[PDB]
Design an enzyme around this catalytic site. Structure first.
Site, PDB file in Angstrom:
ATOM      1  N   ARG A 179      -0.140   9.001   1.074  1.00 23.90           N
ATOM      2  CA  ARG A 179      -0.932   9.051   2.309  1.00 23.90           C
ATOM      3  C   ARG A 179      -0.356   8.176   3.419  1.00 23.90           C
ATOM      4  NH1 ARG A 179      -3.929   6.282  -1.511  1.00 23.90           N
ATOM      5  NH2 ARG A 179      -3.739   4.012  -1.182  1.00 23.90           N
ATOM      6  N   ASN A 180       0.513   7.242   3.040  1.00 26.53           N
ATOM      7  CA  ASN A 180       1.108   6.296   3.990  1.00 26.53           C
ATOM      8  C   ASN A 180       2.525   6.627   4.422  1.00 26.53           C
ATOM      9  OD1 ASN A 180      -0.671   4.265   4.942  1.00 26.53           O
ATOM     10  ND2 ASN A 180      -0.744   3.367   2.889  1.00 26.53           N
ATOM     11  N   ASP A 211       0.824  -1.209   0.000  1.00 23.31           N
ATOM     12  CA  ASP A 211       0.000   0.000   0.000  1.00 23.31           C
ATOM     13  C   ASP A 211       0.854   1.253   0.000  1.00 23.31           C
ATOM     14  OD1 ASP A 211      -2.332   1.552  -0.056  1.00 23.31           O
ATOM     15  OD2 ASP A 211      -2.771   1.267   2.065  1.00 23.31           O
ATOM     16  N   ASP A 234       2.880   2.577   7.100  1.00 22.47           N
ATOM     17  CA  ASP A 234       1.581   2.030   6.710  1.00 22.47           C
ATOM     18  C   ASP A 234       0.623   2.116   7.896  1.00 22.47           C
ATOM     19  OD1 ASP A 234      -0.604   0.665   5.712  1.00 22.47           O
ATOM     20  OD2 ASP A 234       0.451  -1.237   5.427  1.00 22.47           O
TER      21      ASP A 234
HETATM   22  C1  DWF Z   1      -0.977  11.271   8.828  1.00 22.07           C
HETATM   23  S1  DWF Z   1      -2.039  12.672   8.857  1.00 22.07           S
HETATM   24  O1  DWF Z   1      -1.482  13.848   8.218  1.00 22.07           O
HETATM   25  O2  DWF Z   1      -3.213  12.443   8.042  1.00 22.07           O
HETATM   26  C2  DWF Z   1      -2.504  12.953  10.538  1.00 22.07           C
HETATM   27  C3  DWF Z   1      -1.358  13.542  11.305  1.00 22.07           C
HETATM   28  C4  DWF Z   1      -1.282  14.923  11.386  1.00 22.07           C
HETATM   29  C5  DWF Z   1      -0.252  15.528  12.087  1.00 22.07           C
HETATM   30  C6  DWF Z   1       0.695  14.724  12.709  1.00 22.07           C
HETATM   31  C7  DWF Z   1       0.628  13.338  12.635  1.00 22.07           C
HETATM   32  N1  DWF Z   1       1.680  12.654  13.330  1.00 22.07           N
HETATM   33  C8  DWF Z   1       1.935  11.253  13.449  1.00 22.07           C
HETATM   34  N2  DWF Z   1       3.144  10.912  13.908  1.00 22.07           N
HETATM   35  C9  DWF Z   1       3.466   9.611  14.040  1.00 22.07           C
HETATM   36  C10 DWF Z   1       2.515   8.638  13.722  1.00 22.07           C
HETATM   37  C11 DWF Z   1       1.259   9.046  13.250  1.00 22.07           C
HETATM   38  O3  DWF Z   1       0.241   8.187  12.892  1.00 22.07           O
HETATM   39  C12 DWF Z   1       0.658   6.932  12.517  1.00 22.07           C
HETATM   40  C13 DWF Z   1       1.411   6.750  11.368  1.00 22.07           C
HETATM   41  C14 DWF Z   1       1.797   5.456  11.040  1.00 22.07           C
HETATM   42  C15 DWF Z   1       1.414   4.381  11.815  1.00 22.07           C
HETATM   43  N3  DWF Z   1       1.894   3.083  11.425  1.00 22.07           N
HETATM   44  C16 DWF Z   1       1.456   1.820  11.906  1.00 22.07           C
HETATM   45  O4  DWF Z   1       0.544   1.659  12.691  1.00 22.07           O
HETATM   46  C17 DWF Z   1       2.231   0.689  11.318  1.00 22.07           C
HETATM   47  C18 DWF Z   1       3.296   0.849  10.285  1.00 22.07           C
HETATM   48  O5  DWF Z   1       3.583   1.984   9.893  1.00 22.07           O
HETATM   49  N4  DWF Z   1       3.960  -0.284   9.767  1.00 22.07           N
HETATM   50  C19 DWF Z   1       4.977  -0.125   8.759  1.00 22.07           C
HETATM   51  C20 DWF Z   1       4.831  -0.846   7.590  1.00 22.07           C
HETATM   52  C21 DWF Z   1       5.781  -0.720   6.583  1.00 22.07           C
HETATM   53  C22 DWF Z   1       6.860   0.130   6.776  1.00 22.07           C
HETATM   54  F1  DWF Z   1       7.778   0.261   5.819  1.00 22.07           F
HETATM   55  C23 DWF Z   1       7.004   0.852   7.945  1.00 22.07           C
HETATM   56  C24 DWF Z   1       6.059   0.735   8.962  1.00 22.07           C
HETATM   57  C25 DWF Z   1       2.349  -0.482  12.241  1.00 22.07           C
HETATM   58  C26 DWF Z   1       1.353  -0.512  11.137  1.00 22.07           C
HETATM   59  C27 DWF Z   1       0.669   4.567  12.978  1.00 22.07           C
HETATM   60  C28 DWF Z   1       0.284   5.862  13.301  1.00 22.07           C
HETATM   61  F2  DWF Z   1      -0.440   6.103  14.388  1.00 22.07           F
HETATM   62  N5  DWF Z   1       1.003  10.355  13.132  1.00 22.07           N
HETATM   63  C29 DWF Z   1      -0.402  12.727  11.923  1.00 22.07           C
END
Ligand code: DWF
Length: 290
Positions: free
Chosen positions: A157-158, A153, A171
């Site tokens: 957005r990710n 994915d 992700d």
């Molecule tokens: C994204 S937005 O603009 O729409 C909303 C927003 C606005 C302002 C600041 C932020 N700050 C922020 N900081 C850190 C994490 C986060 O959210 C996350 C971002 C990513 C995740 N990721 C995951 O839950 C996983 C993940 O990223 N796995 C993964 C998979 C493949 C990879 F290469 C790397 C990691 C475990 C599944 C979890 C989160 F809670 N959000 C977020």
């Protein structure tokens, strides 16, 4: 009130290696980053052993009654522990509580996701900056591909963006419906980012990640336009098979568009590796003064 004994013991083992004690984490429940059907994300403060405060994002499940959901949630976090690269989001740890959902704790990303950053008209990234973001994604993907990790994915957005403007490939997993859920079509599939063969078989490979990366480059060059604005409900597979690709953005350099077309080669085997992509995009990036 999850029962750890019901989970796969190898998963529990892995989780204990990254455990955060509940007293070291303060969750700011009033300060929500996002909410979705399965999960939600809050601002948090993590204290380290020396008392230093760390701003973090804290991801939680909404329910803990289904073992499949709880297992998948923990597995998603555990997968990240295996990643150590400047362009891949890292895991701070996992907080197991006596009551309620386990919490997956991530370093805070000041600028949120890459798509929301580039769409924000208060920001003014140059063409060079945007190509640079693409280069950073390619480096993160080169790392992941070397680990034989298939993303499935990849999309703006990710990917996250930190305070130093470092892109972190990521992700949202179970919390992916918090934002941009409409880009997922019934399995919930990000069809406008998927390779032709994946649209037909629903199988993914590093070479299908390369196709998605091409779409991500197009997102960057259009500052977050939705791909194929010509198509909403029209079948993207039929559209592509008519002999069509995304158009070259007005400010996309010719060699970068050529890179995009290579990423969308009809034969997965003939798409460039992420190693090749990093090399080629580094060269294009280097031609810009600013
Ligand atoms: C994204 S937005 O603009 O729409 C909303 C927003 C606005 C302002 C600041 C932020 N700050 C922020 N900081 C850190 C994490 C986060 O959210 C996350 C971002 C990513 C995740 N990721 C995951 O839950 C996983 C993940 O990223 N796995 C993964 C998979 C493949 C990879 F290469 C790397 C990691 C475990 C599944 C979890 C989160 F809670 N959000 C977020």
């Amino acid at each position: 009130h999850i029962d750890l004994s019901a989970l796969n013991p190898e998963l529990v083992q892995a989780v204990q290696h990254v455990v955060i004690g509940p007293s070291s984490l303060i969750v700011h429940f009033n300060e929500v980053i996002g909410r979705g059907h399965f999960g939600c994300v809050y601002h948090g403060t993590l204290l380290d052993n020396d008392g230093k405060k760390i701003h973090c994002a804290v991801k939680s499940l909404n329910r803990i009654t289904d073992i499949g959901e709880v297992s998948q949630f923990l597995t998603e976090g555990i997968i990240m522990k295996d990643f150590s690269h400047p362009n891949v989001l890292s895991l701070l740890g996992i907080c197991l509580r006596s009551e309620g959902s386990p919490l997956v704790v991530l370093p805070y990303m000041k600028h949120g996701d890459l798509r929301n950053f580039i769409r924000n008209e208060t920001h003014n990234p140059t063409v060079k900056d945007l190509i640079g973001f693409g280069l950073q994604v390619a480096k993160g993907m080169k790392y992941l591909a070397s680990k034989k990790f298939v993303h499935r994915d990849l999309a703006a957005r990710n990917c996250m963006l930190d305070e130093k403007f470092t892109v972190k490939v990521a992700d949202f997993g179970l919390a992916r419906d918090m934002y941009d859920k409409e880009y997922y079509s019934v399995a919930k599939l990000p069809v406008k980012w998927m390779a032709l063969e994946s649209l037909q078989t629903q199988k993914f490979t590093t070479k299908s990640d390369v196709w998605s990366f091409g779409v991500l480059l197009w997102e960057l060059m259009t500052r977050g336009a939705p791909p194929y604005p010509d198509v909403n409900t029209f079948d993207i597979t039929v559209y592509l098979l008519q002999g069509r690709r995304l158009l070259q953005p007005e400010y996309c350099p010719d060699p970068l568009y050529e890179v995009m077309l290579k990423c969308w080669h009809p034969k997965a085997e003939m798409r460039p590796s992420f190693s090749e992509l990093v090399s080629r995009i580094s060269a294009i990036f280097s031609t810009f003064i600013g």
